[PDB]
Design a protein around this ligand. Structure first.
Ligand SMILES: NC(=[NH2+])c1ccc2[nH]c(-c3ccccc3O)cc2c1
Ligand SMILES: [Ca+2]
Ligand SMILES: [Cl-]
Length: 223
């Protein structure tokens, strides 16, 4: 997260860190046995870390659970990142409490101007790499589709939306991929891609979760 602030320990209880010996992507807990992340974060050997704040220190509240299976959306296109969503089923259910809690899926899509909270342990520099130990937060609005398509002509599909600041300075970045974009208590986006991080007129692009709720529900019901 570039230009964001320290969230404060466990203030984002649905945030998870996907780990394979180091933090490589974020994710969101939607129930006690399933996490939603981005399809481009897929790899084998994923350990899901819940209740984290400092990812390099065991401070208490952490629950480390192995992934039993990861389900990448069948129509995921790695060249356009269209349908960039993945579901991860946990080997055992997590113990939910006030520090580990799931986030609700939306019943309707959010409108331009909605203010959302984006969080993650991704790079904090737009020019260079500085990875934080604790979770960073950024409040950002969803932009209109015209401003999004004008920033990325020909690369925005109906399954994507832009959120951020066109003046630059505040954005999600590498390491934040797969993590949550929460607006009014509902998971509306997944950190997916962008051009550089926090560059002027190049806002972050996110997977539009309201278009996948029936798919997430049907897939969880059958696995
Ligand atoms: N500017 C943004 N809003 C943004 C968000 C997530 C990102 N993830 C990545 C990324 C870069 C290299 C490898 C994996 C990634 O997810 C870039 C990147 C940029
Ligand atoms: Ca920790
Ligand atoms: Cl276009």
């Amino acid at each position: 997260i570039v230009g964001g602030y320290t969230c404060g320990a466990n203030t984002v209880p649905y945030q998870v860190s996907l780990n394979s010996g180091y933090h490589f992507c974020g994710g969101s807990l939607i129930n006690s046995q399933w996490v939603v992340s981005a399809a481009h974060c897929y790899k084998s050997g994923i350990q899901v870390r819940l209740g984290e704040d400092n990812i390099n220190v065991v401070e208490g509240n952490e629950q480390f659970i192995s992934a039993s299976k990861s389900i990448v959306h069948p129509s995921y296109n790695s060249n356009t990142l269209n349908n960039d969503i993945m579901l991860i089923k946990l080997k055992s259910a997590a113990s939910l409490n006030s520090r580990v809690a799931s986030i609700s899926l939306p019943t309707s899509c959010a409108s331009a101007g909605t203010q959302c909270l984006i969080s993650g342990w991704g790079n904090t520099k737009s020019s260079g790499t500085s990875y934080p130990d604790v979770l960073k937060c950024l409040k950002a609005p969803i932009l209109s589709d015209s401003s999004c398509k004008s920033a990325y002509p020909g690369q925005i599909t109906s399954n994507m939306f832009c959120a951020g600041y066109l003046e630059g300075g505040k954005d999600s970045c590498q390491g934040d991929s797969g993590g949550p974009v929460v607006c009014s208590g509902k998971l509306q986006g997944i950190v997916s891609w962008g051009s550089g991080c926090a560059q002027k007129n190049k806002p972050g692009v996110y997977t539009k979760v309201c278009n996948y709720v029936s798919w997430i529900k049907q897939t969880i019901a059958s696995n």
